[PDB]
Design a binder for this molecule. Structure first.
Ligand SMILES: CCCCCCCCCCCCCCCC(=O)O
Ligand SMILES: CCCCCCCCCCCCCCCC(=O)O
Lengths: 133, 133
């Protein structure tokens, strides 16, 4: 299952191409400006077979709870209403979000103790690195 | 989770566009001829959180065991070696198979007591209906 190494609290330490990724999602300028400035915190916990990923920032907080491979409704930070599925590939935690015929993916994997989130939307790619606290 | 209504033994009663689907997978003629003639039987069982789908025919038998949303290695009836994931969407059991940069999906759902499998490969679509025994 999901490695317990994911469990814990994660602090953003780097972000690459987040602006263009947001633009591709349809996020407006003023919103992107605050989205880029946000030094977020991601918290991953588990109770039974149910995994929770909570994102905390000044601007917006989010939280999703899910079982692996079981679709669920999500309200994203920019307030898209998606049908989302989280799966496990080579230890990589892969979230896909579908809405209005569109699709984006957020892949989270552990690299040398850091969590590396890679976001993909229409060939636009961003990378965000977190370190555990 | 996966509805217990899937559990049981299923007999093929109809198949539509299976030939073109096989062609799209790269299946050769003589193999397709036996693949089309095959009156298969699908058996779905569960032990804990692990689901097993066994396909039985004279020509070829197959069997896969998996957890929802967790990638696993599969050897298909035509002997492709794929990385596969099974997920749950609106009660639909969705298998995706990836190999050599390619992708195909087999979606299984229950309709009025029948199991309806829809296979997709490069816009080629097939439908196979099963009734429970
Ligand atoms: C601090 C959160 C973003 C606030 C601004 C809204 C931007 C909309 C896009 C939301 C999806 C962001 C996904 C980031 C993935 C991650 O690093 O966990
Ligand atoms: C009786 C099985 C097929 C035998 C011939 C090999 C054809 C290769 C394609 C294998 C995938 C078939 C998927 C069918 C889905 C189903 O109805 O469960």
């Amino acid at each position: 299952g999901m490695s317990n190494k994911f469990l814990g609290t994660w602090k953003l330490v780097s972000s690459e191409n987040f602006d263009d990724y947001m633009k591709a999602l349809g996020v407006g300028l003023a919103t992107r400006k605050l989205g880029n400035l946000a030094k977020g915190t991601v918290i991953i916990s588990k109770k039974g077979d149910i995994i929770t990923i909570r994102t905390e920032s000044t601007f917006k907080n989010t939280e999703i709870s899910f079982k692996l491979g079981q679709e669920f409704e999500e309200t994203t930070a920019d307030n898209r209403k998606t049908k989302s599925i989280v799966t496990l590939q080579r230890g990589s935690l892969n979230q896909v979000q579908r809405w209005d015929g569109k699709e984006t993916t957020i892949k989270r994997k552990l690299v040398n103790g850091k969590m590396v989130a890679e976001c993909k939307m229409k060939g636009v790619v961003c990378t965000r690195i977190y370190e555990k606290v």
